[PDB]
Structure formats: C-alpha cells, structure tokens
Amino acid sequence: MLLPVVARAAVPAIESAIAATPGLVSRIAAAIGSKVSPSAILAAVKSNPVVAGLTLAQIGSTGYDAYQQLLENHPEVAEMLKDLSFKADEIQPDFIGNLGQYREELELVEDAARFVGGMSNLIRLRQALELDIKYYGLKMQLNDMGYR
Amino acid sequence: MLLPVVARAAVPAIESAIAATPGLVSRIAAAIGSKVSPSAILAAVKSNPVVAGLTLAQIGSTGYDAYQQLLENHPEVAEMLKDLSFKADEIQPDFIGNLGQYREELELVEDAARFVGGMSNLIRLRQALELDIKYYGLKMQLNDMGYR
Amino acid sequence: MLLPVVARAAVPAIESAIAATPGLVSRIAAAIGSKVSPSAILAAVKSNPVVAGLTLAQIGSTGYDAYQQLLENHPEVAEMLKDLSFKADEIQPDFIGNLGQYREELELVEDAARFVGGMSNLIRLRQALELDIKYYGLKMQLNDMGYR
Amino acid sequence: QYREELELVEDAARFVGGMSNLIRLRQALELDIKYYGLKMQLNDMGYR
Amino acid sequence: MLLPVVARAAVPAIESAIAATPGLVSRIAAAIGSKVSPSAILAAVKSNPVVAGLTLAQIGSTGYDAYQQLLENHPEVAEMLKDLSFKADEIQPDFIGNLGQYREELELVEDAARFVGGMSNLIRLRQALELDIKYYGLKMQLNDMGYR
Amino acid sequence: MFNLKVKDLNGSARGLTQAFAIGELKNQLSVGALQLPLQFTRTFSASMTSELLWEVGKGNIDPVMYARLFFQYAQAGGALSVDELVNQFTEYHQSTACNPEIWRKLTAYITGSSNRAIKADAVGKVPPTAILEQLRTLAPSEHELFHHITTDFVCHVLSPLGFILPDAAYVYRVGRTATYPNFYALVDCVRASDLRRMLTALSSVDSKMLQATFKAKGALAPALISQHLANAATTAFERSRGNFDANAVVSSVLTILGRLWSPSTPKELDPSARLRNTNGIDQLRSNLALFIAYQDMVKQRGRAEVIFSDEELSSTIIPWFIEAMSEVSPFKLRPINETTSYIGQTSAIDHMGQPSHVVVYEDWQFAKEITAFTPVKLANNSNQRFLDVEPGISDRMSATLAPIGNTFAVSAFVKNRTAVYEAVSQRGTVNSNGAEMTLGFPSVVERDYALDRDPMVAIAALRTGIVDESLEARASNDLKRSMFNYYAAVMHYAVAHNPEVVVSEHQGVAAEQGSLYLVWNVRTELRIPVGYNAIEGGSIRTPEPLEAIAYNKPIQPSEVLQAKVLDLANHTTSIHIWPWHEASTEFAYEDAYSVTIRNKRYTAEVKEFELLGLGQRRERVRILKPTVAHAIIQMWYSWFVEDDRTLAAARRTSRDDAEKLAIDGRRMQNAVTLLRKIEMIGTTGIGASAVHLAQSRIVDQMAGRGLIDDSSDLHVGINRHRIRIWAGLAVLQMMGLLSRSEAEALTKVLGDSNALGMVVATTDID
Amino acid sequence: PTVAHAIIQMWYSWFVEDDRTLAAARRTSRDDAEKLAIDGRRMQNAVTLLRKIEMIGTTGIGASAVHLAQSRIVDQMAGRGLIDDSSDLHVGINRHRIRIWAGLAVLQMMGLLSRSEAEALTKVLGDSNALGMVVATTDID
Amino acid sequence: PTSMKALDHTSIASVAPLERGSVDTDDRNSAPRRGANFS
User: Fold this and answer.
1) Chains G and H are touching, with contact defined as 3 or more CB–CB pairs separated by less than 8 Å
2) Which residues of E8-39 are buried (b: 16+ CB within 10 A; e: fewer)?
3) CA pair distance G51, F51, nearest whole angstrom
4) Do the chains contact at H34 and F379, CB–CB below 8 Å?
5) Short-list F491, E136, F734, G139, CA closest to H35
6) Is residue A115 within 8 angstroms of chain E, CB to CB?
7) Euclidean distance between CA atoms G57 and F656, whole angstroms
8) Interface list for B 2-61 with A (CB within 8 A)
9) How many interface pairs between A and B have CB atoms less than 8 angstroms apart?
C-alpha cells in the first residue's frame, strides 16, 4: 500500500493530468498493463507504489514533485523502479573514435593535476595565471605599505 | 472524539459538498445510519471518526485530502474503516482458464532466475544482452585508455 | 535407434497420417530438418526417437497412443522434448492490472480459510450455512426421537 | 564452415550447464516482458 | 544522484527560467558543454549536482534560494562552485581597493603565492609561462652544446 | 508404511524385484532350471556416514575430502561425472605446473619484489582471498574448486615463512554417501584413488630447506621461491601421469567375474587357469556388492566386451582394482552378517503356522537435539551470508524434545501391530492370497521431508518401478540413488538370512548375452505357498528376495540406525555458501483454547514467543528441520490410524460375542494409552508454560460475571486433564512434528471414544 | 603533545609519499612481474595500516567510543521499532567501519592528527579495496 | 564530522557455491500457521 503522505501528492496530480488529456491514459494502460479506465489505473496506483512511480514517470510535466516525494518516502522502491525504467540513451556513430583522440590531452591534464594538487588547485592556479598583472603590482604595493 | 486537525479540513469539505449538491445527504444518511438533516450528520461526523471516514468515502472529489489526512492522524481507524468500506470486484469468466496456460512458463522464468541471481539481476542481464554493441566497445576503449 | 516395441505401433500410424495428407509431410520436414521425402523422414523416425517424438507432436490425432507408448518407454526423449517443444502463449494486455484488483480479496479468502481449517472445510461450512432450514429441523427431530 | 559456430555453442554450454539449460535460458531471454511483470506481481502479493 | 529534497526546488525553478526566456541556451552550451536540446541539459542537471550548481549560479532572478539550499544541503560542492564561479573584476579607477569586490581576487593571488613561494616567484613564473617558445629551445641548445 | 502383496509382486512392488533389476518388464522369469551354487561371505559397504560441514579457506589440504567435494560437485551439482572432472583437473594442473611464468608472477605479487631479495624483518602479510582473486586472472578456469586447491597449496607452502594472513575462513557442506556400490560408484572409487595419489604429493611439501636458508642467511631471492613451488607442482604432476581407465578396469574385472560366475558360459570365451588362479579372485568371487554391481552393469550397458590382453595384462590389472578398493575408501569389505542388522521382522500366524501379514521394519534411534539460527547478510546481491546460532531457544526446544524421545520407540509400534493382528484374527486358514507384507522404513518419508518432495512420487517409484520425469534433477537423482539402496539392502538381508544361494542365468527372452540372478533354497515345513511357486519337497526355490523374507521367523535388530544433526555451533565465524534455506524452516504459530463454563464459551489465544520465554516477536529466526523426529512421528500416526480403521472394519462383521468384546476392549485400551501419552507430553517445558498462560487468559475473562467456586476435588482434576491434552497437542503442532489435519483427526479419534471420561472414571472411588 | 604530534605528522607525510611513489612507478613499468610487485606492495601496506588503526580502535577510548556508538544506535533503532540491529551491525563491513572510525576519532580528539588528514587516510583504504578482502577482526574488547 | 563515504564504496570477493538454489529468498515472511480446533 502507498503512504497517505505520498498519496495526497500523487492522486490529484494523476487525476489532473488525465483531465487535461486522455491520450496519456491508453499510454499508461499499455505501459503498466492495466485496464484502460481511469478508475482501474487509479486502483493500480493506490495499490502498488511501483505502479505509482511508473505512472508518475510516464506523466512528466506535473508529476515531478510527486515522483521525488515518493522517492523520499519509499526508499526501497528505487532500485526496482530504476530497473523497470530504462531507455537506451542513443549513441552517436562518431563518438568512440572522437573519444579515442583525447588520450593525448587527458593524460597531460591529469599529470599537471598531480603536480599541482587537486583539480580544484589546478583550476585556481590557471585562474591566477590568467588574472591581470595589475593585481600583482597592487599586491606588491600593499605588501610594501604593510598589508599582508 | 475527532481530532481538530482532521475536523478543520473535514467539516468545510462535507458542508461544501452538501452546498454543491443535496442528493448526497440522503445517500450518506442511508449509508451511515443518521437522520437526513445536515446538522445531524455533521454532528455525527464531529463525534465519530469512523462515521467521518465513511462520509469522506461517500463523497470522493472534494474529500480525498481530508480522508488521507484523517488516515494520517488516526492510525487506529484504518482496518475497521477498510472492513466497513469494502466492495468486491467482479471477476471475468475466462480469467482462471487463461491463467492456467502460463504455469508452464512462469516456471521457466523462475528457473532462469535461480541461475542468474535476483529477479533484478535477470532484468539487468536481459537489458545488457539487449543493449547495443557500441557500449561494449566504449567499455573496452575506456579500459584501453586506463580508466576503470 | 528406436526400440521395436514402440516402433510396431509408431510407424504405421505416421504412415497412415501421411496417406491421409501429404501437406503435413512438408511441415514435419521443415520442423525436424530432414528431406521432404516420406522415406527419408520415416528413416529419421526409425533412427531417432527424438525425431519420432517431434513427428508424434506434429500429428497427435491418431499418433496419441504411439506418443504415449514412446513416452512410457523412453523418459529422456520427454525430458529433451519438453525443452524442444515450447510455444509461448499470448498474454492479455489487461492481465496483470486486472489481477491487481483481486489482492484485496484473496487475502480475505485466506484469512477465512486459516480460521476454518482447510479449503474443503471452508467450502463445506459455506454449503452448510447456505443449506435450507428444514434440514436443521430434520436433524433436530431425528435427535429428538433418539438417533445419532 | 561450421567449426566457427559449434565451438561457440559448446563454449556457451560449458558456462551455462547442459544444452537443456542453454535452450531454456535462450527461451527465457527470448520471452516477453509481461511474464516478468506477472511474476513480480505475484511475488508482491506474497506468493512463492 | 541528485538529492530529491533540493531537486524539488531546483527543477521547476530552471524550468520556469527556460519557459520565461530561451536566451539561456548559449549560456548552458558554453558554461556546461552539454547538448543543445533542453532535455539533455535537464538530464545533465538531474544527473550531476555540479552541473545543477552551475545552472543555479548562472542566473540570479529566482534560483538564489535554490542555490543557497543546495549549498546548505551538499557542502562538498561549495569549493568547486566557488572555483568555477569566478569573474575577473576588471578595474576600479580609484586608489582604495576595497574588499567588497577585490577580496576574492587578492585571496586567490595569495593562495597561489602560498603554493609557489615568494610573490616575486609567482610573478617570475607568470612571466616565464608568458614568454615565447623559442627561449626554451635556446636554453636547450646551450645546454646541448655543453654549457650550464 | 508400504503395503504390498507377496503374491502379485510384479504389479504390487516392481521397484524391489529382481526381474526388474535384470530387465524383465513382463512377469516371465524362470524357476531354477539350470543352476550353480555359490556362497557369498563379504560385501563392500560404506560406514555409518551422514552429511556434515567442512571448511576450505584454511591452509590445509585434506585429500580424501577434496575427493569428496569432487564427488558432490560432479554428481550432486548436475555436472557430467567425477571421471570427467578428474580429467579436466589433470589438464588444469598440467597447464599450471608446466608453466614457469605463473609461479613467478604470483610470487612477485605476494612478496612485492620482482628482482631483489627480501630481508627477514621487512615481511608483510597478504590474505588468501587476494591471492585467489589474482589466481583467477592469471590461471583461468571455470571451476572454483581448482582455484581453492591451488590457493591453499601455496598457502601451505608459504605459511611457515609468514607471508599470509591466517584470518579468513570459508565452509561448504558435504553430502550423503550411499552404502552399496553401483557400477558407476566403483568407477568413481577407482578415479578417486588416483586423485588422492595426486593430492597427497601436494600435501607433503614442507619448505623446510627454504625456511632454514632464510633463517641462516637473512634473505632470499624470489627465484628460490619460484623454483621451490614449481618443482613440487611437477612432482605431483609426475604422480598424475600414466593411469588406466577406471571404466575399462571395472568393466573388465566385472566381465570375467561374470564369465566365471555363470553356469552356461561358452567353452570358447572362458577364463583359463592362470587368471582364475589370480591372487584375489577367490576373494572377489565370494562378494555380494560386486554381484549387484554386475547386475546393474549389464542392465545399463546391455552387454560387455574385453579390451585388455586376457592372459597377462588382466592378470595384473586385477590387483590394481584390489588396491583401489582395499585403500581407505568409502567402501570397506565386511562380513555379510554385519551390514543389515537394523532390520527387524514379525508375522501374524495361522493355526497351521502360515503367515497372514508380515512386517519388516527399520530400528531407529530418536534424535533429540535442535538448533535455531538467524541469517545475516554481508552485502546486497551477494549470497555470501553467514548465520548465528541462538542458545536460549534451541535449549528450550531441546529440553522439550528430550522427553518426547523417551516415549516414541520403534519396536513398540510393530509390537502394537502384532497385538492388533492377533486380536482381530478368526479361526480359519489363509489360502486365497499370500501373506501381505508391510515394510516400515522411516528413511523414505525422512528424505521426502528433507528434500521437500511429495510422498506419492516415492511410493509410486517403489510401486511401478519407474521414477517421474517432471520433478527436478536434485530430487530425481536422490530418488534413484535411494531406490537402488533399498533393492541392495533387501538382497543383503535376504542372503544373510538364507545363505543357501544358487546362481542361475536368465535366457528366456534374453535381450542380453548373460544376465545372472540368484535363487534361494529355504526349507519351510509348510504346505500352502505364500507368493506363487511350488512348495514341493520340503523346501521352496524362489527367485525373489522378498518371498525369502516372507518365509523367515521373527528377527530382532541388534543395531539402531542413527542420523546425526548438522554442526552450526563449532564454526560460527565462517561464511556459509551451502543452501541453508532448504534445510531450515520458518517458525511461527498461533493457537487457542476454548471451554464452556455454564452455557458460556471462553477462548484463550496464545502465540509462540509467549511460550518460548520471549517478550518481543522476533521474525528472522529459523529452525534447522527435525526430519528424523518428524518421520518417526509420521510412521506412528499412520499406523495408529490404520489399526483403528481395521478394527472398525472387523467389529462390524465379527458375528460372535467373546471376539466382539475383545475388539471393543482393544479399542478402549488403545485410546486410553494414546490419551496418557499426549497428556504426558503436555507436562514438558513448552506445554507447562502454555498451561500457565492459557489458564491466566481464561481467568481474567470470567472477571465481570460473579460465579461461585466449584467443588475443587474432581473439577480441578478434570480441567487439568483437559488443559494438559490441549497443550500436548499444541506443542507437537508448533514444532513441525504434526500437521493440523492429522492433529484434528487424532482429536476426533480421541473424542469419539469418550477416552477422557474413561480416564476420569479411574480417578473416582466407589 | 608536540613531540608525539611531530612523530605522527612525519609518519603520515612519509606514508602518503610512499603510496605516491608506488602509484607513480606502476604506470611506467611496462613489465608484468613489476606491475604485480607494485600492486602487491600497495595491498601489503594498506592491510597493515588497517591492522594498526583497528589495534588503536580496540584500546580503552576506542573501545569506549565503539560501545557508545553501538549502544546509541541500538536504543534509537529499538525506539524506531525494529530490532535487526545486533544481527546486522556485527558483520564484516559494519564492524570494520566502526573500529576504523573509532581509531581515527581518538587521534582527532587528541592533538595528534587533523580531520582532513584522517579523511585522506580513510580514502586510501577506501580505494585500495582492502576493507572487503580481509574479513575477520582480532579484538582486545 | 569524519566522513566515511570513500571507505563506504567497497566490494566483497564473491565466490560460487557447489550447488545452486536459495537465491531470491532473502526477505520473505508468511503468516503464522494456526492450530487445529479442540473439543
């Protein structure tokens, strides 16, 4: 059973999305596997929190607050919901050959990073060398006047 | 009696539902067992949380937030209210005979699962074997660069 | 090699099915993977009990008795033939969401059955309470006359 | 021409188990997703 | 992954920013480097909290409360967002270099000075990296001829 | 309880008949036409061996039990055979012993230095899990049991040097060994000796010289370690090489025993007087486990062929097999009177002397210890978990089960069967059918409980001979092994109690060349045959091993049969990989006691944690299953119900007066001893606590209704004897020892006799 | 305690420099029995650091912090209403975690070692995977 | 506070059984069984 804290945020959002468009109803009926009626898929949402998370993932505009609150209050559903919710992030044809050309560069970046410190130390040192020479003159003037 | 946090959301809900339509008043008078006057049913709601949950089940549009808030604040009412508010669903005639065709095949799925590991491990293995080959090449290429 | 005890009843049934129709000969030739000629598939039946069982699965109108005889003689052909003969049945789209609506109610059946005893004890108690009052009166009058 | 194919089949059978286990695993990974959802739901209701 | 507590306040803020103006596309393409589509940058925000902090720091209309909330929730991104959130303040024409604006830049110069050593050592290394490539070849050819 | 007709023994019990053992699906098997006498005096039986737990993560190599783990991984793991398993292990060991790079790379890893020597003080520690995880990468295989046997070899040779941590441990279970050897088991006992010769050369590597030069010099190069390991690996590989086929040794030594056992061998193929005078053939000729293994060989194979040179090779292959057997093995040679002494027999006798019913039973010892553990994971999606025993629950249930073992003997069950069959007997001879035989083997139902198997399929296997193909391999492979054991144990009992055995040769249908079978020459002094044979001449010739039991006298068992409990208490720190879930059960229970006090019903619920001394419902704990206790109690229950049904069937058709009073007095005496038994159970640890809790739940419910205290002379005694019977049923309900259907039927049997009334009628005084 | 703080600071600096030189020398070997020698040496140092920190964490104040942090989580979890605690907290990862935490927190409650130094010295064992390849613990109680 | 997040993400050296089975049975609890009725 789904928690009432999740249900208060989950049920009216699904009802509002169905009242906004009924074209999502057959989509979520085919995705979850229930009868096409809103009463039946709402019974499925109230019965099973995995089905609730699947519906709140299928409707994507208004269900993000309810989805993240379900993810807060039911922490154990996350692994199985991530297993069921998987879509192939489509790869580019030139991506692996374009990636293989950067070994020349990343090794130099990591070696300079080990010499300096962290990657944060490298970024701050690169910003210090990118910064103007007037600041070096100004800090020399403050050190001559006494400001450390 | 009834908690005031519940009452502040339940009483204007039921009163607004009666003001919206009066045909539900005789319906909740027959379902709960009170006199058909709104003062009598509202005093019954303020007196008894079981009667309050029955009224908030008989009105469903404007009373879902108040019903779930009563279910939050009154944990002791839940089983008794679910036992009183119960309607048996109708069964399809062909359901058990259609289910009997699948015994030969859920056993196949379980014998696959006992080999693979978890049911989640089976789902992830089936996704990895359905996955494209460029991801295998990308795994081998990142390991070829010296990244793990 | 197929044993003669099976072969005596297995060969003429397949031969009579071929003499009934040759349209199944191309089916069994494409199913096993032998030549389309009847002598070649009959030699395959005589030389391999697995091929014989696949033919007695393709035709089962007259070859049911020969199939049972090869079943009772060799167990290993059945252990392999259950794996080689598998058709995944069609599943309804509404099946799992339809089955979700019965969770509320099979639980109620089991919570009654644990109290009454067995499933048969529940069914007999249901029939005894649904039975007519005159049977209770007949029971009381036979006890009144001194019978048990 | 089939030495390339039979070697891969027998190497897969060495990992899986028997050839019967290989046939059953190939059928399971060829099987539709609705059966996996059905088994998950019967396990969710409390049925092993 | 991204925290749901801060995600509920971070996603609709940048969603309302994108729905208000489409001029942030060049900003999220140049600052992050993600793909130009609005779904890819939103997936990048949902995957990477550093990218989320960059998208909260690139605007200051409504995302300031979400940026402070992410700063209070995840302290490990604080120094990295402080490092990537650096704009070289050009010049104030007067003499008084007040620490309302220049404190970060003089602190960054003094952090680089604590790394290197002397302030003159930092200026010397700044100049040596500013110099031409040919002086390295000249020093190398003098050290090759037998002089040091 | 398995009931069979000794006359229609084909359709009755085909799974134990010798016609089925040598391939007769029909009933056609000859009486002793052409005959040749023989006297068996030895047998290869296994010891009193049950399953146990053994750990592998330490630096020891125990060669006999690595051989046993090969047995269980090859057979009980669904693999091919231990012959193929030892063949692939020899290939693996050859590849790692004839390769010098591996013994350098994984000494560079576990010493830390490739080229330079190590000092005696700068010696660190690497755990064996790490060296296993890199041995998996360097020397790959598909069987973990090779990587374990390499790992603890190198840990054995480095453990005095101090390069390894002694911390981790790791445990598997070993399985149940059969008592009587199959043909395949003889093949495997020949391969296991060669594997033991392999492994005992690895077990003797000392590194004493390496340790001595380490101490004397102060340093050593890694090349000395890499030589000193790769020399010992090849000294075991030299033992590995140059062996015989176990199949072609056993098939050749069983075929010549067939050709000098049979009476109708051709003169052409016939062992000459050299190999017949081989030293040891006179001992392998008078051996019985080899006879039943020969029957199984020619059953499976169909025929037999010789490969070896039949004059001088085979006269020196035989003592190799004699050494393989006479080595410490599972199977040891014993006299024939020793192996089957737990069987007992009794019969029900006519006035002429003829049996009507004959009962054959196993004499058991009630095991009365019990353990409760809890499973604790290590990491998610990893079944490496280990499990903690809990005293204070196992101690309670042990102290409850220890009095129940003092009232459930096995001799006192057949001793009650005989009193039933002597009390319901008429005066009239038995001619229409042979003496029906019941055989009470608790081990059948005990394995049905242990493997979670339906008892219908085991009874069907013993009845129609064949096993089922629907059920899985880990239950079918134990069903067939168990069924071979029952056939073999029956023939050992029959030959040890009728030593006058004469070997024939079946050639009626003759689907083989020669397949042998014994006949018996038991003298009877009877006149009408039980079974179907001819009784002519003062003695009967019967082919079947069960009729020869049906003509014996009562026999008394000299040895109990013992099953021991598994060991979770000693090694409680190791992690457990064996399936603990099939051999443990979930333990939760609810019961309620109802009594009417002056037209008002009072009910008292009770839970299991309230009985166990707990306050909080714990839900993780699991009991290791008591299959021996449950099997003995199930045999007792089925016999009690069957005896009551036969007396209720005979009381209706008695048609007499004194015999009718005898049947009624027998039923009353029966039910009151049942009631006293359950009531004596209900005074134990869990039972007395259930009494003291249910009384309190009843008394605080009579609080509102003021009622007058009763006589407190008989009323206390009656309500005490009713609450103790309830508690005595409830404790055997809550432990797995009794189903609710059978507790309810047993309550109906006790209720319809007015047994509590007849017990309270002897606590009055007139 | 300036002398003891000096000794432990010199130890920490030399110990981090040893891992830096080993991890730098493995990448430039191009030789299998040298890559295995360096990968063996790193594991062989990481397990000794784990043994030293746990021998500290099972002394007086370390054992007291172990008992206190276990007891407060037991009382909190029994108040929460679920008592899987004495099972799930005496196990191969969640006992090494609490012993190593206590052995570092005694050094932080003294002057002897800083919190960022303790966190980097933690990240060493977190990266060497020597926390899950040991499992056993020799306690002093 | 002293963070343990780097120490948290480890792995245990997995090693296979001789016999499979009993895999997904980690977290399941059926209802308690009743006793028979008494009379």
Assistant:
1) yes
2) bbbbebbeebbeeeeebeeebeeebebeeebe
3) 38
4) no
5) F734
6) no
7) 89
8) none
9) 39
User: How far is Cα G99 from Cα G55, in angstroms, rounded to an integer?
Assistant: 9
Return the residue in F68, F171, F383 with the most chain H beta carbons within 10 A, the one to mutate for interface testing: F383
Residue type, F532: Y
The whole-angstrom distance between D32's CA and the closest CA on chain H is 21
DSSP class per residue in B60-128? -STTHHHHHHHHHH-GGGHHHHHHHS--PPP--TTHHHHHTTSHHHHHHHHHHHHHH-SHHHHHHHHHH
- Distance of alpha carbon F243 from alpha carbon A120, whole angstroms: 67
Solved using: cryo-EM
For residue D18, the distance in angstroms to the closest alpha carbon of chain H comes to 14
Could you tell me whether strands F601-607 and F589-596 are parallel, antiparallel, or unpaired per DSSP bridges?
antiparallel
Residue F539's SS3 state is: strand
CB count in 10 Å sphere of residue B119: 20
Residue found by looking up tokens 């390496």 in the block: F210
Helix or strand or coil: residue A47? helix
HSE-CB of F76 using CA atoms within 13 angstroms = 22
- Beta strands F589-596 and H33-34: pairing type? parallel
One-letter identity of residue F38: L
d(CA F746, CA G6) in angstroms, rounded, equals 82
Residue found by looking up tokens 């979890």 in the block: G77
What DSSP string runs through F620-636?
A: S-EEEP-HHHHHHHHHH
Tell me which of A72, A127, A134 to substitute to probe the interface with E (most E C-beta atoms closer than 10 Å).
A127
**F348, β-bridge pairs:** F357
Q: Which residues of chain E neighbour A71 with C-beta distances below 8 Å?
A: 4
Contact F189, F325 (CB under 8 A): yes
Closest CA to F62 of F207, F228, F202: F202
User: What are the residues whose beta carbons fall under 8 Å from the beta carbon of F602, sequence distance 6 or more?
Assistant: F594, F595, F596, F698, F701, F702
Residue F322 CA from chain centroid, whole number:
27
Tell me the pairing of strands F170-174 and F575-576.
Answer: parallel
- Six-digit token pair at F152? 């603890």
Cβ contact A–E (≥3 pairs, < 8 Å): yes
CA–CA gap between residue F702 and residue F697 (Å, rounded):
9
Structure tokens of G25?
């020398």
Tell me which H or E stretch contains F530.
none
Residues of D in contact with C87 (CB under 8 A): none
Chain D interface includes C86 (CB < 8 A): yes
Q: How many CB pairs under 8 A join C and D?
A: 26
Out of H3, H8, H10, the one facing G119 most closely (by C-beta) is: H3
Separation of alpha carbons F557 and F343, rounded Å: 6
* H23 in contact with chain B, both atoms CB, cutoff 8 A: yes
Check CB contact under 8 Å for D34 and C103.
no
Cβ-contact A66, A10 below 8 angstroms: yes
Q: Look at residues G94, G114, G95 and name the one whose alpha carbon lies nearest to residue G104.
A: G114
List residues in chain F touching C: CB distance below 8 A: 466-467, 469, 740-741, 744
Bridge partners, residue F594, by sequence: F603
Give the phi and the psi of residue B49 in degrees, each rounded to 5: -70, -25
β-partners of residue F344 are F361
Chain H residue whose CA is closest to F751: H39
Sheet holding F515-520, edge to edge: F36-38, F501-506, F515-520
Tell me if A68 and E4 make a contact (CB, 8 A cut-off): yes
The token pair at A106 is 């990343």
The answer to whether B69 contacts A7, with C-beta atoms less than 8 Å apart, is: no
Decide: C53 and C28 in contact? Cβ < 8 Å.
no
CA dihedral F394, F400, F402, F406 (to 10 degrees): -160
What is the CA angle F620-F626-F627, rounded to 5? 130
Report resolution (Å) to 1 decimal: 3.5
Give dist(CA F665, CA F672) in Å, integer: 11
